[PDB]
């Protein structure tokens, strides 16, 4: 067995390679690469042994069963979908949140998680928005950016980290800020915050809240 090799046909467009069939044939050297033509487990018992059936037949059959489905293609699970992102949302961009309790608050974009949800920070000390996930379709990306190119975000801040932990009620149950979350907030904030304060008046901008007023129409104004 040989080691895998990268596709020798660079993608021109989706579904079309750069090279034709005969071009690839030479590239792959196919001229010289020619070729020509349990269910049971036996055990001892205190008969001596028994042939044990690994899987046993059903002990109950429903009166009716549904048939199988016809096969389809291209219907991948969510985990295998390709993640897209608006060209206007680059790391360090200032986003306006439109929904949730934090709606109207201007936050700092950090990165897109593997599920396509965005990672943002308030930072907590400016608008009281922590390291939080948000959906790109529910934010307005402004033209104001900061260079967080030199910021190191922890690698354990993943979708699983931010996923809600179910709380059982039989009265209520209250969400508690884990100590790890607070430590992570200071780790990220301690780097982003000085970069915010370099831009004059930027910190005050992140404390303010976005709103529509008399005569202000979204389609007219640049963000």
């Amino acid at each position: 067995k040989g080691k895998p090799h990268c596709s020798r046909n660079p993608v021109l467009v989706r579904g079309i390679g750069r090279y034709s069939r005969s071009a690839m044939y030479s590239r792959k050297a196919l001229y010289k690469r020619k070729y020509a033509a349990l269910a049971t487990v036996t055990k001892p018992v205190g008969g001596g042994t028994r042939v044990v059936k690994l899987r046993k037949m059903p002990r109950y059959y429903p009166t009716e069963d549904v048939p199988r489905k016809l096969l389809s293609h291209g219907k991948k699970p969510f985990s295998q979908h390709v993640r897209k992102l608006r060209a206007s949302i680059t790391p360090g961009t200032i986003l306006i949140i439109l929904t949730g309790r934090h709606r109207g608050k201007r936050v700092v974009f950090l990165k897109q998680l593997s599920s396509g949800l965005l990672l943002v920070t308030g930072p907590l000390s400016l608008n009281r928005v922590p390291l939080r996930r948000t959906h790109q379709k529910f934010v307005i990306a402004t033209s104001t950016k900061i260079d967080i190119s030199g910021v190191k975000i922890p690698k354990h801040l993943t979708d699983a980290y931010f996923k809600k932990k179910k709380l059982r009620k039989p009265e209520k149950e209250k969400y508690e800020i884990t100590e790890q979350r607070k430590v992570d907030q200071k780790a990220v904030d301690s780097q982003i915050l000085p970069k915010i304060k370099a831009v004059p008046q930027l910190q005050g901008y992140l404390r303010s809240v976005f709103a529509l007023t008399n005569g202000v129409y979204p389609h007219k104004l640049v963000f």
Partner: peptide, 4 residues
């Protein structure tokens, strides 16, 4: 045949 030649292909093989």
């Amino acid at each position: 045949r030649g292909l093989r």
